[PDB]
Design a binder for this molecule. Structure first.
Ligand SMILES: CCc1nc2ccc(N(Cc3ccccc3)C(=O)c3cccs3)cc2c(=O)n1Cc1ccc(-c2ccccc2-c2nn[nH]n2)cc1
Ligand SMILES: CCCCCCCC/C=C\CCCCCCCC(=O)OC[C@H](O)CO
Ligand SMILES: CCCCCCCC/C=C\CCCCCCCC(=O)O
Length: 410
């Protein structure tokens, strides 16, 4: 009777046809699917709930099941004729109609306006602007560590590692700009959908985690000033491989779920997160929650604790003259890294959380969902913009941070 119960019946019986031996097992599973499809056709989905049945989107919902019943009948005729393997092969087309429903009515397909007025759009233009700016500033930091500075100092190792993680992350921007321009048509294959997808997640986490390491190292330098006096930076050689391995382990679900799947309504081959279709909404909300916790929640708490910790040790001294001037300058540099992390990542994680609620069934309003969809590529751009801000805050401007920290300590 219920829409959730009807789609559970449709998915469970699709697996039965695959495991079926004779025509009787195929006929039984198709009849159960035929009854569930006509029952779901009568029901109203959580999305577009406050809409009349005469509406074109409601007419399209009923028509979606008319294609499904028509496809069931074609396979049922082969099953009634004795053709077992032919009916099972015909039942593979039902999976395409099933995937069309999860993309349109469970996803943002029916809400967001599909027609795209692509004529040198702002997204590919802004993506290439951030690319060349970010690539040029990060190349300077990488080339400086190679033949202009050296491999000395604890903090300096993290500067180079953050610059490499940022450079490789910004290097993926021309791919996404081309991917956007072709109306989400992945022209690299299902193998490169996993490769580029994981490479993006790996370098993104490596960037975020090295920012976290910088905050911990900056905090440790204040509370324990004896650490900088140490001739040997023993922990640095073990922290760097651990962070890269943590970024690799975090990019594992990306390598497992990313795959090129055909979008039935758009008529495009998109590199999407191919979760099990029977529990697609649950997986989409779970991974979106994982994005917020691991990529924003845990690092922001670490970055803030380190900032308030430096503020606690500095403000209790009650300085006068140049000691007060140099103190305030250190506090402005320490606040700049926490502020830049918020401005650049908060819009994305808020929209990711709002999108997670849309999958669960909390946000069903198409007006809200349409805004989330068009704002998302701009929010993604802000995440990449953090990689352009990083060389300035840590290498260029943040070079006098260690000198001013040694000035207040004398
Ligand atoms: C700034 C970094 C970034 N660049 C991106 C570039 C492009 C896109 N888009 C949408 C797009 C395409 C073209 C133009 C504009 C938008 C895509 O379709 C693809 C992404 C990966 C392969 S295709 C998304 C992102 C994007 O969400 N992010 C942030 C981010 C957040 C979370 C995770 C993550 C964490 C843990 C577990 C899994 C994931 C995970 N999310 N998506 N796949 N894997 C990874 C990356
Ligand atoms: C300097 C950077 C210029 C490189 C941009 C090349 C370009 O215009 O790309 C077209 C794109 O594939 C379509 O949106
Ligand atoms: C677009 C990045 C802007 C960064 C803002 C950080 C400045 C904080 C200083 C006050």
């Amino acid at each position: 009777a219920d829409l959730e119960d009807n789609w559970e019946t449709l998915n469970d019986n699709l697996k039965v046809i695959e495991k079926a031996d004779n025509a009787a097992q195929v006929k039984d599973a198709l009849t159960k699917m035929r009854a569930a499809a006509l029952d779901a056709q009568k029901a109203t989905p959580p999305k577009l709930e406050d809409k009349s049945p005469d509406s074109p989107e409601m007419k399209d919902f009923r028509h979606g099941f008319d294609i499904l019943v028509g496809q069931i009948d074609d396979a049922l005729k082969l099953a009634n004729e004795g053709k077992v393997k032919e009916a099972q092969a015909a039942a593979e087309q039902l999976k395409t109609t099933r995937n069309a429903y999860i993309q349109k009515y469970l996803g943002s397909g029916s809400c967001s306006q599909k027609p795209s007025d692509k004529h040198l759009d702002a997204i590919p233009i802004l993506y290439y602007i951030i690319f060349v700016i970010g690539f040029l500033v990060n190349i300077v930091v990488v080339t400086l560590f190679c033949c202009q500075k050296g491999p000395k100092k604890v903090s300096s190792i993290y500067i180079f590692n953050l610059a490499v993680a940022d450079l490789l992350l910004l290097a993926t921007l021309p791919l996404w700009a081309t991917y956007y321009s072709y109306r989400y048509d992945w022209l690299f294959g299902p193998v490169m959908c996993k490769v580029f997808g994981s490479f993006l997640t790996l370098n993104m986490f490596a960037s975020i985690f090295f920012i976290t390491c910088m905050s911990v190292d900056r905090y440790q330098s204040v509370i324990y000033p004896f650490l900088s006096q140490r001739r040997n930076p023993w922990q640095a050689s073990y922290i760097v491989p651990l962070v890269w391995c943590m970024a690799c382990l975090s990019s594992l679900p990306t390598f497992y779920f990313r795959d090129v799947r055909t979008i039935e309504y758009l008529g495009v081959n998109a590199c999407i997160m191919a979760f099990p279709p029977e529990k697609y909404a649950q997986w989409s909300a779970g991974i979106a929650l994982m994005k917020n916790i691991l990529g924003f929640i845990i690092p922001l708490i670490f970055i803030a604790t380190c900032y308030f910790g430096i503020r606690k040790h500095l403000l209790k001294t009650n300085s006068y003259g140049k000691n007060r001037i140099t103190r305030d300058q250190v506090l402005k540099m320490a606040a700049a890294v926490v502020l830049a992390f918020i401005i650049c990542w908060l819009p994305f994680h808020v929209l990711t959380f709002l999108d997670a609620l849309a999958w669960m069934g909390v946000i069903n309003s198409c007006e809200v969902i349409a805004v989330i969809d068009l704002a998302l590529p701009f929010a993604i751009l802000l995440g990449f913009t953090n990689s352009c801000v990083n060389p300035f805050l840590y290498c260029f401007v943040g070079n006098r941070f260690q000198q001013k920290l040694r000035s207040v300590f004398r």
